Amino acid sequence: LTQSPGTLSLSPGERATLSCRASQSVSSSYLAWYQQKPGQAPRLLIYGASSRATGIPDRFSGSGSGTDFTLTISRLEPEDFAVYYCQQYGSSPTWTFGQGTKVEIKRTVAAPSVFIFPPSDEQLKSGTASVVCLLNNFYPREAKVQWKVDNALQSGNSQESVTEQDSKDSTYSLSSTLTLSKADYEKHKVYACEVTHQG
């Protein structure tokens, strides 16, 4: 299955449309749609390519034809901020799900506040280093991060940068960790991190 756009990030209160599309491998009535918040079991929103399940708000609406189909959300709420899946019957043998379009609906717009952390006495006496660079209070998650000593260390195979965390501050946050030997903290005379955001 194709599902688009890969994320849908419009303001609350609007009308917003997800699409679900296929080859001729599938049959026209058996489309359905599902909501999943982080870590939850999915919840059935739409079946029959157009019918709401019982206990789903009248502001959701499915429609389509042939192999081009859609779910329009209307009067959007923060409760809609979730991954949304279509699915369709593979004509008779098999069950097929869509991409999981993240409904990343508009919260704020902001560039990151940033904090930068060299190695520390317990970490170094344990025979290790890990340099840390922290980003927070931003939206969208438009972030890019680069490590330097003070030229470059972003080429290091031991560098990491975890997926972004959304917050009650209506904004994303993320961390990069540059794990290293204690001999790198002996080698490099300074450590630094640089950030690109909003484009």
Binding site: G39, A41, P42, F115
Partner: protein, 227 residues
């Protein structure tokens, strides 16, 4: 109304075999398909197979056929899935689900199959690692700790296995400005994470900071001070 109730989570080596369970309650088990669905962390949903509990006939996605097998038991009101020849890529959720409403009880009338009710999603973790407690190390920004720098003090929690690690601040009495970044599985085969207090030493509640970390599998406890 309808209840699907799975097994608790599992941890395995590559090449192993695991069995998952899904009890049924609130409905007549015989009348319905039971389906099994994968989800790797941050990936989409993926159907693996189904069983008819009324006689034991079964269907699979050919992508998972021969690794997976599914079975049912009308004496225990329970469906089960076995996954064999495990790999690190099998580190995922495995839900049970109805795609089934002989009557779509509390949901509709007609079912269109359409995945109506779901179990809580049993985790399987696959790694070469074995049970180990975390290291915890303190973090303060810039070259040595500083007065304004007290506003972002933290810890790095490193190389623990399996999950869960649990974290709190100043013996569980500090929650103002507490933040945690997502855990990641390292190339070692063991997890790591980071956490911070996003508020400076302007108060008796922030004059000092403590990363209280407990790893359930090891029974490990750490009360790491940040300065």
């Amino acid at each position: 109304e309808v209840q699907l109730v799975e097994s608790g989570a599992e941890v395995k080596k590559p090449g192993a075999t695991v069995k998952i369970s899904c009890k049924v309650s609130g409905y007549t088990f015989t009348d319905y398909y039971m389906h099994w669905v994968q989800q790797a962390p941050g990936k989409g949903l993926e159907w693996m197979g189904l069983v008819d509990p009324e006689d034991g006939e079964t269907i699979y996605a050919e992508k998972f056929q021969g690794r997976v097998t599914i079975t049912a038991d009308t004496s225990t009101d329970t469906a089960y899935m076995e996954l064999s020849s495990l790999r690190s890529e099998d580190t995922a959720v495995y839900y049970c689900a109805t795609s089934s409403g002989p009557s779509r009880l509390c949901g509709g009338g007609s079912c269109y199959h359409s995945f109506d009710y779901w179990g809580q999603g049993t985790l399987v973790t696959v790694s070469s690692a074995s049970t180990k407690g975390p290291s915890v190390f303190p973090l303060a920004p810039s070259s040595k700790s500083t007065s304004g720098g007290t506003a972002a003090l933290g810890c790095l929690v490193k190389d623990y296995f399996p999950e869960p690690v649990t974290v709190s601040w100043n013996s569980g009495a500090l929650t103002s400005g507490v933040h945690t970044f997502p855990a990641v599985l390292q190339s070692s085969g063991l997890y790591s994470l980071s956490s911070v207090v996003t508020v400076p030493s302007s108060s008796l509640g922030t004059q000092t900071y403590i990363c209280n970390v407990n790893h359930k599998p090891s029974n490990t406890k750490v009360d790491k001070k940040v300065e």
